[PDB]
Write a protein that binds this DNA or RNA. Sequence first.
RNA 1: CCGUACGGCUAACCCGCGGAAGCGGGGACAGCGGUAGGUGGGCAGUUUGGCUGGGGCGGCACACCCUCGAAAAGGUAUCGAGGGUGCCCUAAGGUCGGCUCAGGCGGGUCAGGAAUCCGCCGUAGAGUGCAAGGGCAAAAGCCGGCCUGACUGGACCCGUAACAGAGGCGGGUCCAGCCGCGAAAGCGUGGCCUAGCGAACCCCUGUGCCUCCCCGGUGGGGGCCAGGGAUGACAGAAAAGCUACCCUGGGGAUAACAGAGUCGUCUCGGGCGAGAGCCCAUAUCGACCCCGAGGCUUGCUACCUCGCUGUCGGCUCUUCCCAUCCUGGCCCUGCAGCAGGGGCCAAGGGUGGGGGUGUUCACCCAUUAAAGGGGAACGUGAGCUGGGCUUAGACCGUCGUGAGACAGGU
RNA 2: CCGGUAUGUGAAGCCCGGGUACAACCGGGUGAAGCACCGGUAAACGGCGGGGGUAACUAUAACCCUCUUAAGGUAGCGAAAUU
RNA 3: GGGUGAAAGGCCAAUCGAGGCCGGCGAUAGCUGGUUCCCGCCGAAUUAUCCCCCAGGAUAGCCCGGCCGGAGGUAGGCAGUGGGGUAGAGCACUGAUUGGGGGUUUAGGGGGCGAAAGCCUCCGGCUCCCUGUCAAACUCCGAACCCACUGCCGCCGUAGAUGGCCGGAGUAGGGGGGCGGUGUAAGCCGUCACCCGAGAGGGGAACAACCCAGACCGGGGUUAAGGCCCCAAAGUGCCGGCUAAGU
RNA 4: CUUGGAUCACGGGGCAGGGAGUUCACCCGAGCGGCGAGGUUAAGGGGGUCAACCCCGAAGCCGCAGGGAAACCGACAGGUCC
RNA 5: GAGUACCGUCGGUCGGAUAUCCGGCGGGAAGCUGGGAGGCAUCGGCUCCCAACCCUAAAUACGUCCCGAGACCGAUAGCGAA
RNA 6: AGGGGGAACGCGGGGAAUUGAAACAUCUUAGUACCCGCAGGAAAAGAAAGCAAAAGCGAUGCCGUUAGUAGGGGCGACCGAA
Lengths: 59, 93
Amino acid sequence: GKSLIQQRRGKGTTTFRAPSHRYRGAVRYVPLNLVQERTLRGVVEEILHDPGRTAPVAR
Amino acid sequence: MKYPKQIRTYCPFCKRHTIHKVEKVKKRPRSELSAGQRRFRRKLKGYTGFPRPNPAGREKPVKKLDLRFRCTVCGKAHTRGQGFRVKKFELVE
RNA sequence: CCGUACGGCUAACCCGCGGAAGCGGGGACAGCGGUAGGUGGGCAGUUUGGCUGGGGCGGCACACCCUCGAAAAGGUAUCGAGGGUGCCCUAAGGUCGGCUCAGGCGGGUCAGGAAUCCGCCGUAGAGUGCAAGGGCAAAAGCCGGCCUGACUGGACCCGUAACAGAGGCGGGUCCAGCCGCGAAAGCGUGGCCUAGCGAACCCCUGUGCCUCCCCGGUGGGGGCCAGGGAUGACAGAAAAGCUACCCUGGGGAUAACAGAGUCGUCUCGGGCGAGAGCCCAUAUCGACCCCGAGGCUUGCUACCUCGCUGUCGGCUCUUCCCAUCCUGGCCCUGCAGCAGGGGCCAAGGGUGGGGGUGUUCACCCAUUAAAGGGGAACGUGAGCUGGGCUUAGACCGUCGUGAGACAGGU
RNA sequence: CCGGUAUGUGAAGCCCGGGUACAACCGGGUGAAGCACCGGUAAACGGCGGGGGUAACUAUAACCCUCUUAAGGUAGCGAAAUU
RNA sequence: GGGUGAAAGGCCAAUCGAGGCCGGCGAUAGCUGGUUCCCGCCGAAUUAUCCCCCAGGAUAGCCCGGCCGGAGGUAGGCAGUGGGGUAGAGCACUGAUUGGGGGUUUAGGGGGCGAAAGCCUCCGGCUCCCUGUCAAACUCCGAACCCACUGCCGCCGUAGAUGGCCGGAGUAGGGGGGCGGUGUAAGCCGUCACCCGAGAGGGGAACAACCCAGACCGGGGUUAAGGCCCCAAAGUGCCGGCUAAGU
RNA sequence: CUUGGAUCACGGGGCAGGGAGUUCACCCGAGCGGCGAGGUUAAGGGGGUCAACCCCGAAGCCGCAGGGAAACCGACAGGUCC
RNA sequence: GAGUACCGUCGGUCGGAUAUCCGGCGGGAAGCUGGGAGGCAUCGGCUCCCAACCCUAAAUACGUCCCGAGACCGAUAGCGAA
RNA sequence: AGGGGGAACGCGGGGAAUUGAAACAUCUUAGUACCCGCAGGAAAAGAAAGCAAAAGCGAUGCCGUUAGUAGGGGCGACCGAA
Ligand SMILES: [Zn+2]
């Protein structure tokens, strides 16, 4: 027979691939390496809309 | 159909007439040491479609008897004629 | 001493952070490799029979026995006519002896008497293990006795299948061996005769012998002879469907389709005379039963055409037949007149317009002298149209597990 | 389709016995998944029939029991793109 | 056997219910088409059994070539020795089928004088005599005809019979005419083995198989089928009779 | 092709050239020829006027003895008649 | 001369059949008083050999080239290409 | 030092279906077509842990026989050594 849409998704083509190049970066915590017990401090500069996050991000 | 348990008949080993006990032959399965079974088993191995016919549902409603007649003097058995078909078979005095 | 499960641990292995060293989390699980069972149209390869007054549904004429067909030797077919077998029996098998049946009548029981008792007549009008046909009476039938020849080793011949070929399967005539019955002669290799059944390879059992790679032993294998285990599509594949998206090769050896043939049916008639018609067969009507014409309806058949044209209806245009609806001329009448019925001669002319429906036909409307019916490849697509019908798209109902289908609708 | 479960069945492996100077081989036991068994699920696939009888005269079976079967077409719509 | 698809099996270079190019590949088919000079000798078959067999094959039958062998054979007829159950006929068995008489009178429903199955009748069965009819699956009878065998006639045969061996085939859709079963019929299925197929010529107006008749080449004659008014070779022929409808 | 062809059954506008039972292996027969209870060489070797010719080479194959699954056993070269 | 000889199981291949060779997986020796083979496995004899390391000419296969020859074709033929 | 190229011949791995069995699944087609890697003018093999059987032989390769034999195989079609 012929293939299903979810079978065609696994091969990873532009028709099924995420346009991550349009997105703000990935959101991750700082690593424990640098935060053994240091307790850094920061300040918020700006709040931004992200097209791949379903939520706003802050710098 | 009724049939006697003992009969007086010719014995080919004693070469006279003696009394004979009647027995039925008991069937038994295929021996694995036999050459036909060896060949079947070595052709059933590996990647292969089934290599032989397989008749399922092949049973005559009525079969022929397989009778043997054992002498009391000599201890040996023989067969007596061809087999005949009948559904019921009772051994009686 | 062997296992199984439960609990915990970290050092293998795994996951994350890391430039790395190392840290954190999991943890002998998972993952990886080998093997064993299940599930598995997700993916492949195949099969899905034949005969057939086309094919399919149906049936089996797809293995056998009897009567007819069948033509007084033999042989002879059809989805020809009438029916049966796919068993049963330790006796319904072998032999010896003795006896004779069905029914009816006359006596005696008695609801017919179904059966018992008596005598007579009685060529079988009975019975046989089962179909049909054949055979049979001091019997092949009934009543009893004794038995297992329903056996082992082997030859030859006949039939299935004539004449004229056959594996397997039936059957017949005998030779030896060992036995049964009988006084003896004689009979006995199943059932009075003709139906009741099956290759190769493989396996099981019996029995006595031969054999396994230099030799000899043991366990286990292979071989020769005999009997059993099955293939009814019965001289024997292991086996479900749809295609209206369909393709290739062919077929007029075979349907739809017009034509040829035929005429059961269809359209149109006749003979005779029961009667109906107040009486009066025959103005008119005319039962039951018999005899026909045409080829314009439908069927039957399968001679012609398998890319001749494969179409219905309508519009347009031409022509022919008469079994005459009107128009011309006549006859009878249960014809006063007006009109009506029925019949004869005559085909020169006429036979139209509208509503619903793809319609032909049929139905209705208003007029009209009347608003007849058929043929010409169901006249006419190198003349038109394209509403129906009969491809590929889609919806409803019903049937189907489903893919799908419907001489059902849109 | 999902879940659960004492028993049963259940291949290889393992164990026991017999056999073989050893093996092949024979019998039994244990043996996961799955099957079996017990339950839930229809905006899952699907189904929603049968009778034998009718109260006041012309028709009504409009009401009530029944035995078949898991149950027996509710509201609406109806000669329908379904007759 | 993959892509893509707002899903039509739509589109992927005029190619899609699995693209195009080359290769496997001179794939396979029991189905269709084709197969090249002359004369001469002989000359068929479409029917039985078997096959997942019915548009195909095998075994036999029917043709041809060569050899062996050595004395008979039998397509016709006569006489006899035996066999048969068709046509016809008939009722002696099996089964059917009209009616009138003489009887037992009854198993049995209506009954009637039934003081209640009753003795008497009564419609009904069975039994003999008449009377009128039948048979593919009936027969007390029974042909023509066919078959086997013996002898003789005839014909064939030592210029080689019956037969036997070796080898090469083709034929497995038949048709007309007569007979039989079936069918409204046409047709379907068999049978015989004369013809067409595979057969010229002379006639039926023309006609595959109806009649005459079987063919090397050139000539001369006599007949056959049929025909003799003209077409058209040969008679407007003879005797006796009929028809008036171009029958 | 077909039971059946002048067919409203298929192929057929003209001319010239091309165009269809071949080769090998095994088997069954025959028309000739050689040797004959025996017949015959293969690969190869030697010589030569050097792919033709002559001489060697009997390995093997068929036949002379068959029957039998096998172990095994093991026959008239002529007695009589037509 | 060791994950070797050998044992079992799976897959492939072979004429190799209970008796061919290769590979995967699980086991796994003796080692000179030593070890292997002899078509099912084991026992006894007899015969023949010494694996698990390495190298080696000639006799053979071919012809994009060269030489020679031909009962080969003779311009629609012969290689597609005179 | 290696890489790339070379008609046929050579070595090592991967590996179908048409077709035949008058269907078809074991089988056959076939270790074939095709694919990947590696060399040379030749490559590969090669000096018995062998063949045999009362006798013995003495590495390897090639030709002729052995032989359509032993043997494999829906023991069918066919396949096939030393
Ligand atoms: Zn005895």
